[PDB]
Design a protein around this ligand. Structure first.
Ligand SMILES: O=C(O)c1cc(S(=O)(=O)O)ccc1F
Ligand SMILES: O=C(O)c1cc(S(=O)(=O)O)ccc1F
Lengths: 399, 726, 397
């Protein structure tokens, strides 16, 4: 019923995994840093009208355990009534928190909510939480568990995407992310990380390789995997396929990074009361997925369901933003819906700038809010694939 | 770029021998001690650049010192001037310092520290970067990381390395949180020092003998610290270890309990830097330590504490309040009159320094009980191993309990500690002044009575002087020296030197009622009692005192000062100016004191005060207190209660400075910290003004603006004097 | 404004901590067992129409890591489109999942949602996941972290609840839970846990001590790491000493359990032959100071009443989680709740507090008691760590 509006969307720069600038920064500090930037931009905002803070975090362990959302509320000195809940829907946790915040507003029982994610994979690696599947061979044996990398190799094998095809996409992502950083597209969204003294720690996505070349990508060696068994397991399910063409390397897959993002979502009455200017509007969200062994073809039905739910078609969308977990996933999504190539990941993606699991959904969402405003266009569609065979998609309209 | 450098005279002498063992002898020609200053950083940069340049011809390194000390301290003169905008320079300095030590630590060859003396702060940090530490077991030698006492933290790798050596818990509790200084034997037993020798001449030979043996026996592990080996296991576990993660949340609360909630951010930062550093690699850990270090140096509390415990304390010990030109006069025999807590404690600290003490009282049974205070003190010291049986026997043998004035023959230094009464003190001095030596110092331990009045009871008034101790005398570090208007400058210096000889700190105060410490702690007590009469919860008053940083809450302190004595002071201070023609404005606390006396609850000595006293111990507040004073009817902010007690003392101190009672803010700061327990984070009741910080701002102006905000709400006794106005 | 309805609300028995029957059962198996029961009750259900599965879990590590809701969707053989997300809002994670499911339905973008929670505290003890507010001395030192036990004792000190007062409520809970079990109130809602052979593992709440007497409660001994007492009084500076009245007998039990709730629109219920049992009238979220921690349910309950345009008199049944006895007494004292309307079937002191599931368990407990008493309204609320609070009102259909 109630319409949900995005009033602010900011993100930290994404720090690399090996010798990264953010490895010394506690995950709680990345989120509190963004809260202190929202305070700086709206000093007179009555923080008591913030009814919840929803953070996505795929590995809620160690520095990221104990409800890090609540920790950020108390650490930043936000009102003790401002809640704080962590969620985990694997790679789409950041976008799921944004959608949940939007649905909480649409229900009317919530006025103004902070949403986003946080992930410091240099401090809390993926799999640190273990998992009800790994520590249980009976379930692992029956669900035929296959890590994300092999589903991507399998997708490229089935659809006929070659090693040069995925490296062609890896090159164009590094290029567009370089163009966007040069043009200043990220100037007001990427909030530099500073220490307790105010000294600079990171001001740019340091995983990028702007000097990437077709020749340099072709020399990389292909990628839970590197152990045994998962290839044969995947082909036991997809028994018509004979051999898996391993095309994905470190250069055409999403990088391991640290980062956090924040999106402020509220109702029109909330923004009007607090003098906030709307930037976009959550038109519709949707959830769907496909087989867990192929794992990553879930954003195709989730996109059709959110398009069907919004009453639109692909031709009505000005910008498509799909997370670059693997190059073959995007080429499949592009091949399926016949996405015009110049509407797809127009400012780069996770291959160039990184994929901070819990925070990625809210980062690429804020990427589109700024790009619709810059281009003066109406609609964008943000979607992420998920481990286990899920998918999430959202359509926003510039206000 | 990433360098070992940040004009100055070189401080390190270089010597390579035939074997290839380079000996770095630190010898700063600009002082008697090696100090971590610009000259050191530049020189250690040159030396480490040379150790790397000549790596093929160097088999080991020996770090030594040419001073009486090994290395002690850093550039406090620079650290205190660092503003918040200077955080980049401060961060880059400790990063440059640690980059030098980390290169020395990872040269691929053994480095040994020859510790010939004191290795404090940055000195121990240099030695902690070495693979082997050999300390000479000489007198006066100490080792420790006392940066926390100046509001800083060991930022040259001290926090990172001691945590890698002993674990988070042991390093924080034993070394870091308190800046404890160890004698070389204690240092070897807890692991700070590896081995000991008896003379400094054996050090460099033993260091080269260890380097030669280490290369022969353990070639692959030579020059490799324990935390640079594969399979390094941090003692006590890492924060992700489930054994440590179960008790880790209790560390900030235990620290918060010991500090009683007072604003001390240096221990809070040390604990954070220790735990955050144990979660990452060594290099990432030390960079975190640098950020917390820069966070402390640019803060106010560090500047408050650097001013008091470094500059003011050195100004006092150098004789800033000692009369100019006067020479030294020996003390052969000390005569103490009275064997109470004061006289007994005085006799102990005097005999502990080595002075022969005659302890007189009215009876031999009493004087023997006075010496028993020393015997029971030495008993605890023996079972805890802090003294030998030999020196303990000699100490007690210097205390001669007596009951005759004839045994004061040959006494050239008298310290009277009898009851507070003028005509009693006139009589006690009258019958000993002729027995003592003709140049004897005639000192009175009085808290309030003016020295000029007590001095007229003797003939040699120029040698009469007030020597105010504080109980317990064996542990309170201040001596308040009061100068009557007939007191000579020689007597002043003689008492001043005695104060340093017994290991205490002197302040010179001009004669006046209440002196400095009694007058100021009176305003602290009176503010608390006024709050009780206003209807504030007694538990909230004690909480304010402890959270303000005071060592003992004010109501508990009142029970020990005896409210009967407290009332007599106010009666004696009204007729001191009302009989003089002026006016006396009564304090609201006087009605509270008179009502507690009306109900027979005069204090702890009586058995009942604001607290219940059962079986010698103190068992909770008197329940009738809330009903008597309508407690709960006034609930001001806790910060107002804290500021009322801090400002009342800070303003009475400024009054003393304007009246010539005190002659230096160094005496005001140290006198308030060590005399009456003003919170160390303030740097003293005088530093508190120039470093106030709250919602208003920082500095003298913010203090005045806040003092006026308190005057509007609680009375004009908080109105700032003209001297603080600008 | 689609309305949200509860069609099914079931739970497992709560197995005790020491020598518990559920210690050999993985938390994933507890949820799949409840899912398989929903299939037995409605085999005609088109599981494709289930949009999402939202499970609350406070310690999502080890056997409970890796999005356990998604693990349940795959292990149970549910459609892969049925989502799966784990959330954590401490003790309210079970009820937040339900409330979020209702808010997902009201927004009109989810049609039929499974909500609930799972917590196997015997296998994954609380605090196993770490956390910043405890294992980071910079924020721990600033937020004045205090365990929930001490906040409960501080409440009893401020309100004047004696050791006999709290123990009296503990006896009340033990007796009311024993009556509800003997009376058959929990017959159709407590799904017995069985192994892969169909052999019985547990069919009742082990933690109950139905022969409790006030003499045995007075024998028990009253966080032992030190420091926390002085930290709490530094903030609550008008209190001189904390009276430690809470023991193992008047505090919530440490148990294993899981709960499931089926929530959907009236259209989704009509389409699948589902009879609605109750309706989610309103939800709310507020909080109070985190050093006392457990006083957040009072403003959250006051909020959810004003939102639904109701008052205390309009509520037939109040269900507050019995984390500590003084929390319920303070709550009952403030809102002047009648004694016969409060936790009428016992609570966590008798049956246990399986963190991630308790909110969904007491939610299911009330849905049954409304249909049994033929009453109209019930209010459910829980205290939370860090000073939060959640509340929910349900109306019978
Ligand atoms: O007298 C000093 O210079 C001094 C030095 C330190 S240090 O820890 O910086 O070495 C601490 C306290 C001190 F009083
Ligand atoms: O019991 C007594 O009368 C008594 C009285 C005081 S007084 O300080 O009130 O004079 C001091 C000690 C006492 F034992």
């Amino acid at each position: 019923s109630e319409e949900a509006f995005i009033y602010e969307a900011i993100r930290t720069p994404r720090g690399k995994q090996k010798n990264g600038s953010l490895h010394e920064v506690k995950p709680l500090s990345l989120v509190v840093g963004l809260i202190d930037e929202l305070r700086k931009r709206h000093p007179d905002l009555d923080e008591n009208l913030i009814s919840d803070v929803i953070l996505g975090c795929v590995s809620p362990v160690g520095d990221q355990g104990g409800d890090i959302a609540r920790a950020a509320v108390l650490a930043s000195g936000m009102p003790v009534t401002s809640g704080g809940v962590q969620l985990n829907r694997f790679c789409a946790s950041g976008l799921e928190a944004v959608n949940t915040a939007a649905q909480k507003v649409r229900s009317g029982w919530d006025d103004l909510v902070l949403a986003g994610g946080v992930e410091s994979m240099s401090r809390v690696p993926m799999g640190s939480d273990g998992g009800a599947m790994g520590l249980d061979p009976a379930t692992n044996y029956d669900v035929m568990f296959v890590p994300q990398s092999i589903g991507a190799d399998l997708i490229a094998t089935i659809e006929g995407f070659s090693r040069e095809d995925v490296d062609a996409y890896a090159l164009r992502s590094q290029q567009k992310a370089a163009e966007a950083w040069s043009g200043g597209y990220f100037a007001k969204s990427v909030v530099p990380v500073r220490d307790q003294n105010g000294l600079l720690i990171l001001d740019h996505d340091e995983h990028m390789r702007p000097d990437t070349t077709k020749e340099g990508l072709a020399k990389l060696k292909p990628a839970l995997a590197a152990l045994g068994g998962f290839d044969d397991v995947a082909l036991q399910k997809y028994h018509w396929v004979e051999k898996i063409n391993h095309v994905h390397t470190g250069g055409n897959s999403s990088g391991i990074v640290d980062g956090a993002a924040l999106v402020m979502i509220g109702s029109a009455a909330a923004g009007k009361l607090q003098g906030l200017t709307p930037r976009a509007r959550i038109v519709a969200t949707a959830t769907s997925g496909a087989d867990p062994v192929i794992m990553l073809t879930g954003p195709t039905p989730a996109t059709r369901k959110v398009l069907d739910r919004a009453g639109l078609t692909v031709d009505d969308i000005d910008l498509f933003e799909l997370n670059e977990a693997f190059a073959s996933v995007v080429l499949k999504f592009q091949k399926d819906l016949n996405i015009p190539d110049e509407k797809l990941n127009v400012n780069g993606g996770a291959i160039a700038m990184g994929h901070p699991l819990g925070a990625t959904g809210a980062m690429i969402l804020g990427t589109m809010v700024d790009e619709l405003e810059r281009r003066n266009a109406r609609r964008a569609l943000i979607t992420l694939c998920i481990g286990g065979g899920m998918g999430v998609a959202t359509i926003i309209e510039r206000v | 770029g990433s360098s070992h450098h940040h004009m100055p005279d070189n401080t390190i002498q270089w010597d390579k021998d035939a074997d290839g063992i380079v000996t770095l002898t630190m010898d700063d020609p600009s002082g008697s001690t090696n100090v971590m200053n610009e000259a050191y950083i530049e020189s250690m940069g040159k030396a480490v650049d040379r150790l790397v340049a000549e790596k093929d011809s160097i088999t080991g390194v020996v770090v030594a010192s040419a001073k009486k000390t090994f290395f002690a301290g850093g550039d406090v003169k620079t650290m205190i001037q660092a503003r918040p905008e200077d955080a980049g320079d401060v961060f880059n300095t400790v990063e440059t310092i640690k980059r030098q030590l980390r290169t020395l630590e990872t040269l691929g060859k053994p480095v040994v520290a020859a510790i010939n003396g004191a290795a404090l702060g940055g000195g121990l940090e240099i030695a902690l970067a070495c693979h082997h530490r050999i300390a000479a077991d000489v007198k006066g030698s100490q080792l420790g990381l006392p940066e926390v006492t100046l509001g800083l933290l060991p930022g040259g790798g001290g926090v990172t390395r001691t945590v890698r050596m002993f674990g988070i818990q042991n390093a924080f509790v034993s070394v870091l949180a308190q800046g404890t200084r160890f004698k070389p034997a204690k240092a070897k037993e807890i692991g700070l020092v590896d081995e000991l020798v008896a003379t400094v001449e054996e050090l460099v030979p033993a260091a080269k003998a260890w380097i030669k043996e280490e290369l022969k026996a353990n070639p692959d592990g030579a020059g490799v610290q324990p935390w640079d080996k594969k399979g390094y296991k941090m003692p006590g576990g890492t924060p992700s270890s489930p054994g440590l993660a179960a008790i880790l949340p209790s560390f900030p609360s235990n620290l918060r309990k010991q500090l009683k909630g007072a604003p001390m951010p240096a221990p809070r930062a040390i604990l954070a830097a220790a735990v955050e550093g144990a979660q990452v690699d060594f290099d990432t850990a030390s960079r975190i330590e640098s950020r917390y270090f820069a966070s402390l140096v640019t803060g106010q509390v560090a500047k408050n504490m650097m001013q008091a415990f470094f500059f003011d304390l050195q100004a006092i010990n150098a004789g800033g309040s000692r009369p100019e030109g006067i020479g030294k006069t020996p003390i052969k025999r000390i005569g103490v009159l009275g064997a109470g807590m004061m006289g007994a404690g005085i006799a102990y600290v005097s005999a502990k320094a080595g002075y022969e003490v005659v302890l007189k009282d009215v009876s031999l049974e009493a004087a023997a009980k006075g010496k028993g205070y020393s015997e029971k003190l030495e008993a605890k010291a023996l079972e805890r191993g802090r003294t030998t049986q030999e020196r303990s026997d000699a100490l007690l043998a210097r205390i001669t309990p007596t009951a005759d004035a004839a045994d004061f023959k040959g006494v050239d230094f008298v310290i009277e500690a009898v009851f507070e009464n003028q005509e009693l003190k006139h009589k006690v001095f009258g019958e000993i002044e002729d027995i003592v030596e003709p140049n004897a110092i005639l000192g009175s331990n009085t808290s309030t009575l003016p020295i000029t009045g007590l001095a007229t009871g003797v003939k040699r008034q120029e040698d009469f002087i007030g020597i105010h101790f504080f109980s317990p005398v064996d542990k309170m570090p201040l001596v308040e020296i009061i100068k009557g208007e007939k007191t000579s400058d020689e007597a002043l210096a003689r008492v001043f030197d005695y104060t340093l000889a017994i290991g205490k700190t002197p302040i010179v105060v001009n004669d006046s009622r209440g002196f400095f410490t009694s007058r100021v702690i009176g305003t602290f007590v009176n503010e608390a009692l006024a709050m009780l009469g206003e209807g504030v919860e007694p538990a909230s008053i004690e909480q304010a005192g402890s959270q303000a940083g005071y060592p003992a809450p004010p109501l508990q302190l009142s029970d020990e000062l005896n409210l009967e004595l407290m009332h007599k002071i106010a009666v004696a201070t009204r007729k001191g100016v009302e009989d003089a023609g002026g006016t006396y404005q009564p304090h609201p606390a006087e009605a509270v004191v008179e009502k507690m006396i009306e109900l027979g609850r005069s204090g702890r000595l009586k058995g009942a005060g604001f607290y219940e006293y059962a079986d010698g111990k103190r068992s909770g507040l008197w329940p009738g207190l809330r009903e008597t004073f309508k407690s709960g009817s006034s609930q001001p902010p806790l910060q107002d209660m804290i500021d009322r007690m801090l400002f009342a003392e800070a303003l009475e101190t400024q009054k003393c400075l304007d009246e010539g009672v005190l002659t230096s803010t160094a005496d005001a700061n140290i006198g308030s910290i060590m005399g009456i327990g003003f919170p160390p984070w303030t740097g003293g009741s005088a530093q508190f003004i120039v470093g106030y910080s709250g919602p208003a701002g920082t500095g003298k102006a913010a203090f005045v603006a806040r003092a006026r905000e308190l005057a509007a709400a609680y009375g004009d006794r908080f109105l700032p004097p003209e001297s603080l106005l600008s």
